Amino acid sequence: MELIKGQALFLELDKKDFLSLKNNDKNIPTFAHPKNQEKILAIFSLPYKNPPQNTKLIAFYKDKKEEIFIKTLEGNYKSEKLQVENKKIFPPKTIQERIAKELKEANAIYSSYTPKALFNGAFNIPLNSFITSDFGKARTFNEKVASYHSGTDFRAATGTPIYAANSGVVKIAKDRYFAGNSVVIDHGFGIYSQYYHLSKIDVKVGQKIKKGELIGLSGASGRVSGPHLHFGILAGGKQVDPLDFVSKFNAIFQLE
Ligand SMILES: [Zn+2]
């Protein structure tokens, strides 16, 4: 198989006698195929930055081993040269401490795997507008990716109602330094949706939110060029192309 860097892929395997799916020594979790009871699924994601050129997964069964080969593709992402080197920025210590604490909190949240579905059918787009900044727009330094857009931006004047893309449990609902006012929803199976730069948060941590319920109002909080909604998906441990992910997920789980 082939997969563009920064995208997720739903791998299908036989359920019977399956033991484990591994990438080197890393275990990849599995979940049931919703329609074919003889099948299970796993989400494999390639990091946008510095991906391997190829990946070989091993599915271990009771009586056989299967190999899955995935070639990394570069895709057709927008890219331009970094005007100034991404040097060490030098924030005040109080800001450095906040950034580090919020990184630690986020890592803990994305490492807390929910082994059941919290979603309800297909994902919906969180608002009815249009993309203003595509996922995966990159800035390069000596033809090495220095930074990239890790979600997708939608046009939104400040105060635009934002709705949960799918049902789940709220894991972040607060102001963070870079993301601004942030909502992150766990959908199960290591799938998280992200809503950043909000002007108002209308949910609390731990809340079971239903698809299409209001989560807040769009804004321009945090690090932003102006008002908009930033929408992201983390799945298979990595930020992935969110609309591409929604299409692939919906092809499997839409109800039906
Ligand atoms: Zn963005």
Residue numbers in the entry: 20 to 275
Quote what the paper states about this structure.
We have described herein the reactions and the structure of Pgp3, a Csd protein of C. jejuni. This enzyme turns over the cell-wall peptidoglycan by both the d,d-endopeptidase and d,d-carboxypeptidase activities, as documented by mass spectrometric characterization of the requisite reactions with synthetic cell-wall fragments. The Pgp3 monomer is structurally divided into four regions: the N-terminal domain (NTD, residues 21–95), a flexible linker (residues 96–147), the LytM domain (residues 148–259), and the C-terminal helix (residues 260–273). The Pgp3 LytM domain contains a highly conserved tetrahedral Zn2+-ion-binding motif (H168xxxD172 and HxH249).
In order to gain mechanistic insight into how Pgp3 works, we have determined the X-ray structures of the WT Pgp3 in two crystal forms (bound separately to tartrate and to citrate). For the tartrate-bound WT, a model accounting for all the amino acids of the recombinant Pgp3 (Glu21-Asn273) was refined at a resolution of 1.86 Å to Rwork and Rfree values of 17.2% and 19.9%, respectively. Crystals of Pgp3 could only be produced in the presence of either tartrate or citrate molecules. Both molecules bound to the active site of Pgp3 via several hydrogen bonds and salt-bridge interactions between the carboxyl groups of tartrate or citrate and the Zn2+ ion. Furthermore, in the tartrate-bound complex, the side chain of His216 (NE2 atom) formed a hydrogen bond with the O3 of the tartrate molecule (3.4 Å), and the side chain of His247 (NE2 atom) formed another hydrogen bond with tartrate O3 atom (2.7 Å). The O3 atom of tartrate in WT Pgp3 (open form), which is the position of Wat-1 in H247A variant, is seen interacting with His216 and His247. Specifically, in the tartrate-bound complex, Wat-1 and Wat-2 were displaced by tartrate O3 and O41 atoms, and in the citrate-bound WT Pgp3, they were displaced by citrate O5 and O6 atoms, respectively. When the structure of Pgp3 in complex with tartrate was overlaid with that of the citrate complex, their overall structures were similar with RMSD of 2.95 Å over 256 equivalent Cα positions. However, both structures showed a large deviation (RMSD 6.98 Å) in two regions (residues Glu99-Phe109 and Thr159-Val164) near the active-site.
